[PDB]
């Protein structure tokens, strides 16, 4: 077996038309692997500072210095994970972010094909390498499935039948799976995107006090990739099978923001429970990865609470074992949503928690005064030590 490190990425977004028209001010600053946020109503106290692995300032589109270009993000996550998948190991992207955060742009990108998301670049690179390396001996097959999780019940997004609750089973060797989940082959990435649009049309969406169309459920797009090898014999062997998972996570809601009763509160509670369990398993896996990776001791196998939710149960193979993980969080850049943004950071801080310390914005006047005082002290000490004053 092997561990599975997790890459924590956070990205802002350039203002939108409504934001631009209004006089709203930005509130998020980002430098290196650190971000800081200022409370608009408490300018006096302090800014909250968090430190991630990967930090991306996509605020100023025409910026030339320290602009988080889309190709940069793709090279920094998706290329490495696709290479890992080609070696024959399962990999996964979680996409977290509340309404207005801008998760969809990062995950899919614009249809103009000038600014891409992670999914189109991954699919294009996969199929380019498939066509490039298809020699006489090697064969490649790709299949796609798209499911939805709602109130701890699985539903099919591609099959147009009645939205019944599918049954979750556990094959002894192939692990957890879902019965009657339609599985389809695809020849071009255009087919993949068409299927994605068709499934996204079928997502369970309800109107809230915040937005009229907010996702009420999780969604998983699995790309199943099979490599067949033809050695110099009569035996053709399916050498490895690997999975690429694209999980869309709904945000975390508060009952105060959405005071609706009945189905709405049930959906919110289920979403919060699933997100908490997902964070717990990811944190445990990151800790277990970090430990052996340096110490190389096998502390039994610990216990990873996979079964506490259907989401972590179905993604059991992808998360655990020899695999790769990466979570991307979108942070709206306005202020009106300040608390929301903070919550996102607090969810993106979870797992692989690392030390950030306090970021202090010094007054330039006091900085210059202190520097000049130090210079005067040094020069005076040098002069008086030699008896020249």
């Amino acid at each position: 077996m092997a561990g599975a490190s997790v890459k924590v990425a956070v990205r802002v977004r350039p203002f939108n038309s409504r934001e631009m028209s209004r006089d709203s001010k930005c509130i998020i600053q980002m430098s290196g692997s650190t971000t800081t946020i200022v409370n608009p109503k408490q300018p006096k106290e302090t800014p909250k500072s968090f430190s991630f692995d990967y930090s991306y300032w996509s605020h100023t589109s025409p910026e030339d210095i320290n602009y988080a270009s889309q190709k940069q993000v793709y090279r920094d996550i998706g290329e490495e994970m696709l290479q890992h998948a080609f070696e024959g190991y399962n990999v996964c992207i979680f996409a977290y972010g509340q309404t207005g955060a801008g998760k969809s742009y990062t995950m899919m990108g614009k249809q103009e094909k000038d600014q891409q998301g992670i999914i189109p670049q991954l699919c294009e690179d996969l199929f380019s390498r498939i066509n490039d390396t298809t020699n006489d001996n090697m064969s490649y097959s790709v299949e796609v499935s798209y499911m939805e999780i709602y109130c701890e019940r699985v539903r099919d997004l591609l099959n147009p039948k009645n939205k019944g609750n599918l049954r979750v089973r556990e094959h002894p060797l192939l692990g957890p799976y879902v019965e009657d989940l339609s599985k389809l082959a695809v020849t071009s990435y255009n087919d993949i995107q068409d299927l994605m649009d068709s499934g996204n049309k079928a997502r369970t969406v309800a109107a809230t006090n915040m937005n009229e169309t907010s996702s009420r459920s999780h969604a998983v797009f699995n790309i199943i990739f099979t490599q067949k090898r033809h050695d110099a014999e009569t035996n053709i062997t399916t050498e490895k099978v690997s999975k690429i998972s694209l999980v869309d996570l709904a945000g975390s809601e508060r009952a105060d923001s959405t005071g609706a009763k009945g189905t709405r509160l049930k959906e919110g509670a289920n979403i919060n429970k699933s997100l908490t369990t997902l964070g717990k398993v990811i944190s445990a896996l990151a800790e277990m990865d970090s430990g052996p990776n340096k110490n190389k001791k096998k502390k039994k196998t610990d216990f990873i609470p996979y079964r506490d939710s259907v989401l972590t149960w179905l993604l059991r193979e992808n998360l655990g074992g020899n695999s790769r993980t990466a979570m991307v969080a979108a942070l709206s850049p306005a202020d009106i949503n300040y608390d929301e943004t903070l919550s996102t950071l607090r969810y993106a801080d979870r797992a692989k928690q690392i030390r950030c310390n306090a970021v202090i914005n010094e007054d330039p006047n006091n900085k210059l005064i202190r520097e000049l005082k130090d210079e005067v002290t040094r020069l005076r000490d040098l002069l008086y030590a030699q008896g020249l004053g």
Partner: protein
Amino acid sequence: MRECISIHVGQAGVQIGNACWELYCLEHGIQPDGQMPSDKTIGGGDDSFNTFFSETGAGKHVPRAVFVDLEPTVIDEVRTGTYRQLFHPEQLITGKEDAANNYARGHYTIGKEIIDLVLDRIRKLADQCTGLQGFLVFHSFGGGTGSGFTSLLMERLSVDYGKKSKLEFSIYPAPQVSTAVVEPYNSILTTHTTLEHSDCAFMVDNEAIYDICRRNLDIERPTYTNLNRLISQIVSSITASLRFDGALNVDLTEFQTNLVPYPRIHFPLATYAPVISAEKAYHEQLSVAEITNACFEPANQMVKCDPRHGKYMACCLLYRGDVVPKDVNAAIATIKTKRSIQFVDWCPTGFKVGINYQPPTVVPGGDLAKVQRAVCMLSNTTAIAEAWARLDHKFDLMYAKRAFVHWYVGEGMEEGEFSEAREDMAALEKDYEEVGVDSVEGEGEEEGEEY
């Protein structure tokens, strides 16, 4: 008219209210059915004091009280008890399940659908009131209703009324003793509302009262009735200054003005000096000096924290009975010379004094002796930080593994609401550690110009 509205939330609040209203009815000669034979016998007077009772035309007296709970049991015990005819038939009881020791259940899910009725009744009481002074909220940390619903109620009251004072009596969890597994979560989560919205929060501890009721009042097996009676005596000592005459009279605003150096440190301790049994009431002079000294004894504190580990920032002494100002001055002078009692260097005065002529009453069937003098001391000090620090440690030991968390998130909260609250708690602790430090040596570093 100096008038206050008492709000009782949760089981602890309702039972403390039972004790308090027994004491008030005994104090003012009001019968359990609301009638006062004293006025009929004498002819008239002000014995229908407007602080706690509103008088109707027929001569009945209705308390200015609001009881709230999510269970029907504790209030159904009052609707069919001895005082069933004293209270207005409203009691604001949600005929549903309880908060179930869950802050989120009492603040988000089930706290709604009952807050509106409570606020409507509070507004109805306030409309009848002239010259309202403040609110007296009784609750308990560690409970579901008493934490979450109290937080919601305090937030809404601060939004609505704003300027009126809001005094809070609360039962902080004990260090070792407890009656629930998830006390730290609720107690920490209540920090937000008990900090920003309340004006002065008095904390009492069950372990301290058990210790008192075993060394002083020699009882070996106490129940909650004794604790509620002692707390009722404390509240009566606090509120006596706007019901009866006295040489020096202290209103509710003077309390806040004298005991609160900064807005964020309004957590004073409270103590009652002449806690003694009838048998030991003899063999004891019980002079002003003795009770004043006993107020400062660490053993007699109502919260398990040692004052010697901190510094006193303010004190407020409320005397009752045959007390003369000269003896109070002598006692304060004697206390100021002791070395074990350290005051912060930036508060040279450090004492508020109030004297009231009305002596304390004796509840029939009670445990306290009849005495001629009494004193209640409030002390804003830095030792309270210790009482918080232990709790924080406990919280960490449960939040590292995220135990019991899914119950809270299943009712409408999120994980972050934990951590934020903890951070806020840390800030409060640091604030105390900032204020108890002595002023830096020659606070203008050093000085001295030519001449």
